[PDB]
């Protein structure tokens, strides 16, 4: 068995080909996915995985310069928002319209379907460089 | 949005194609998948999501006519063992040693990964049907 | 087995795949399938099964937040026409010509052939979100 | 469009292809399709399209030399076994046990999946030739 | 057997997929086949068979409402484009110049390549409707 | 365009491959083509292109060292039997019953499908060498 | 084994699909082929086969209609390009500059690649029609 | 990028499916690749990398249960023979002759190839758990 | 460009994945390829390329250890008989007869076939080891 | 065994196609690959192999007209930016910002991934012609 990094098989097999500025998703159950964009879903049940469970499993297996989000987040999702803002604290976190958000995902390596059944509960995380 | 059935995409489409005595696999994190057997990995850390979470929702989303399992879970694992015992109580469930337990898994429509890190944690479901 | 949603294998994954504002077409026996578009016939002789059947059993498994038809139908096909209005009176239904409607359709998951002879008998669902 | 023949497209492209005695199997909701073999679904929900149904236009649409279907049928769905041995009242009836049934599935071309929710109304129809 | 519709496999498969307003041309031994078009070849030596004897067999197994033929077919191929006229003569008949024909033959679904060795002998069948 | 050799485009493919003792199949319109062997349909209509027209065109076009033949065919179809007792002279000709026959088929690189409707109507051309 | 046509498996297939101004390159060993366009190495070592070896038996077995040249090679390969002159004397020859002339080749059928090194030894050959 | 694990992302994706008694196979240039192993070649030149530096890496990275080596390794290529011996010095060392050594490799999950320019230069790594 | 090496891309490719045992055939033109054996036709017209010098440079660019040969060629086909023993006079010749030949070239990597015009012209080449 | 050449099998097929201009990557651990480019990666861990080390090897078995890289590279990777100059001396060296750099990569045949952990440490090395 594989000693380090993530324990997914899938998703080590997308981290493992990221390079500088490479992007994934991290998408609640009701995000859209774009086609040619490949679909790793998660899910369970309603609420199993959580978008922030998730999304901590992928900030330390990652290395992420960048975080982008839905404004509507903010006003719709004040848990999952603020959640962002704690850790990702070092990363420049920008936030757009919904509508802009989802052409951004059309340039994914992939997404990630999470169980989360909340508003804008979706995310973008750009990979940064460890040199 | 899919409104009834399980959430998982992935998982809807296998339980999608069973027939009468088709047979999926919940494993825990260290079983070897079959060459030619589909793998469907959910696990995301140490036991997240658990073998039992996994068998539940399962349970509850497929007609189960038969469950198997390995002998040495008994022994190795009782907290699982039982709650086999108690979820698929009206069930019939076999008992097999571990060898001969992967040897039937060639035959799986799939194998489901978990984040289960406990010995024997793995049972075959062999779906019934509506009628 | 499969214990909840719909019945039929293919039409099940392409529900399980589905995120907002994705889109399905339930299609009279003439209407042409753009290149690319995945095409699941459920035709068996005319009028089996009816359009009126199949978007009947597509309403109750699937999230629909609009339906957009042809404008044509309210003219050749009154009798469907009203059926739609009718079963889906709590969405936003929208006309378009028919050269527009089939233009829509290339951006649809897939296309579901029913044996209904009738003119127009075709409309577009577009996935709701369940939360 | 095509005039004549069976509306299917599916089955257009499978009935095209068979030679004498090819085999081409009509099955219940719940039989298992080995792997390897094509399946075409045509179930919208239980009982449409019922097992009588796909057989009769198969019948009209395909030379078939002889049937075969489990013993078990004339047990537990003697409706549907009076059906079969009047629809083709002029050929060759075998009733083999539902076990060695499934085992001839195995070499067919295709099965037909309806939305028949009784016991054992499945059968194979083996192709004749037209001259 | 298949017993009724035409006789060809391949050409059985095209027509089961035809919705209206498709469409599929035949063609000389010498038409260029645009790339990403099936090509059907159903020559077995020059003249043979014809493209009389092939239009005539299509005609009698599809819904054709128009017919496409490039203009230099009057001049250079007179008994041909005769009967086309007559074969035809409920159907529209439009004439392009053969540079026109040629572009339009990228929206074919299929070319059926037939042993004819006169000039110009091609024309695009667009599929009418069964109701 | 290709200057010398057989026209059809899809044989051409097969007949440059052949190597000393391979074997292709012409079949009447009825028989069956084993699972893995290539299937090239020139049939337009019922006796078009007959076994006869089509086996004399490969009979020139390719070196043929052998035929194998079912032995039903001298009784069941007399004519067509005398044609190939003419057309292969020099070429020794065997028979096998029709049972053996198709079991050799298996080992053909090709089908050919004429629109023969004779029974028996079919043979194995073994290539032979050019040196 | 096949009697007519060239020898080559590869180029015997190429031949058997060309169409009417369909276009094939042969080249030297270093012309670069664009992306999707079919490559057929038939080099051994510098010199063999002979970009001459391989223009004569395709003009032998092809029905040229046009030839295409680079310029640069009547200033750099006075030899080549003299054959070239004499082996084509009853076709078109268009001479355009070397950066032309390759952008051209993105629209060919197929590369063929020879062991000539000399300068600009590369060639477009456009298929004309038997009639 | 990601954070954790070994550094090459094809390895990365087979470490990644690992499950308990899986095998690797690092070998030297020289061994040869059964049909249908995933084959890692990471030479660039003679010595580099060399056996020993790839074993390490990889026994960082991964659970080794067990290792297999040919016998002759220990008479032509004691230097590396030895090597392997301390790495592992935990774990169970078996030999076997080099013939059965390469019966085994058919069964591995890829071959990683090094620049090892020495004899017998090859092991197995049977994959452990970690519970 | 490659400076060092085999010139043929097919080839390079072929022998860049070689293991020491791996085997490679050269053919003539009549030699029959087995299904699954990738091949790489480099004839151009009859005796060219000729068998001797597509043996030359293999034996150049390959480090043979073992060459194997059909025993009618010593009789039947002298002068390349000859010219084999004289090729290859350190590497092990194993003559067996050309039934059981044919049958040691299912296992081979590839057939290079070349324009050889003469009987029994074929031989194994079996790779070495560089170190 | 492959006697001359460079060692990897994955890049001996890559310079195999080489032809005039075009062009390959030699990459950091951080660079990304553009969707639609082969990456070979070979890597085992942090610096190992060397840029300076594949581009060594690179360099010696590829005849290069042209080398590209990012003007960034001069000041914040002094070392490798002198080994650069001082190995393709001979060859034209052009600089361009990074992020045009990246652009360039689209349209390279390959991408080689190194183990160099240094910013800036890329280059795109374009194919020259041998005569
Ligand atoms: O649900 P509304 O607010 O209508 O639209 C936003 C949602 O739709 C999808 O893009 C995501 O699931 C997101 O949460
Ligand atoms: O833990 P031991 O008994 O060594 O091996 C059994 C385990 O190995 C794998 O098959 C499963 O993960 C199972 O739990
Ligand atoms: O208006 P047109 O396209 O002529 O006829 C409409 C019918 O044609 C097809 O699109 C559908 O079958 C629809 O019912
Ligand atoms: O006899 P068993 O296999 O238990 O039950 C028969 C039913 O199981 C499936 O094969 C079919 O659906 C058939 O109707
Ligand atoms: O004969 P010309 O006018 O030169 O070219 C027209 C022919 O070329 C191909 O498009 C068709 O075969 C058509 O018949
Ligand atoms: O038609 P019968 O004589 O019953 O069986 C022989 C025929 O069945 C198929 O193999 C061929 O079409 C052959 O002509
Ligand atoms: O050799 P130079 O003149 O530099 O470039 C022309 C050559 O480059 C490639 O296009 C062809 O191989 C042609 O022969
Ligand atoms: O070198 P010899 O001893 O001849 O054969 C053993 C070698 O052959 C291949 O199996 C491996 O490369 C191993 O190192
Ligand atoms: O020519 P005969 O002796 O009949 O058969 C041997 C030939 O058949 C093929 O295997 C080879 O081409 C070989 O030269
Ligand atoms: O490290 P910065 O300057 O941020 O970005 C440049 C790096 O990102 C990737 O393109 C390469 O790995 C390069 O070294
Ligand atoms: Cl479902
Ligand atoms: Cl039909
Ligand atoms: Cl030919
Ligand atoms: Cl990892």
Redesign the interface.
Known sequence: ??????????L??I????????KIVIA??????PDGVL?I??????G??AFQ??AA?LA????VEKVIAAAEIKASNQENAKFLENLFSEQEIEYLSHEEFKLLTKDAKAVI?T?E???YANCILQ?????
């Open positions: 068995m594989k000693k380090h990094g993530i324990l997914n098989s899938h080590a097999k981290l493992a080909d990221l390079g500088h500025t490479d609640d159950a009701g995000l859209p996915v679909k879903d998660l899910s369970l049940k309603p199993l995985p469970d998730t499993v330390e297996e990652m290395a379907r169980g059944f909340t508003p990979a940064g460089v460890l040199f």
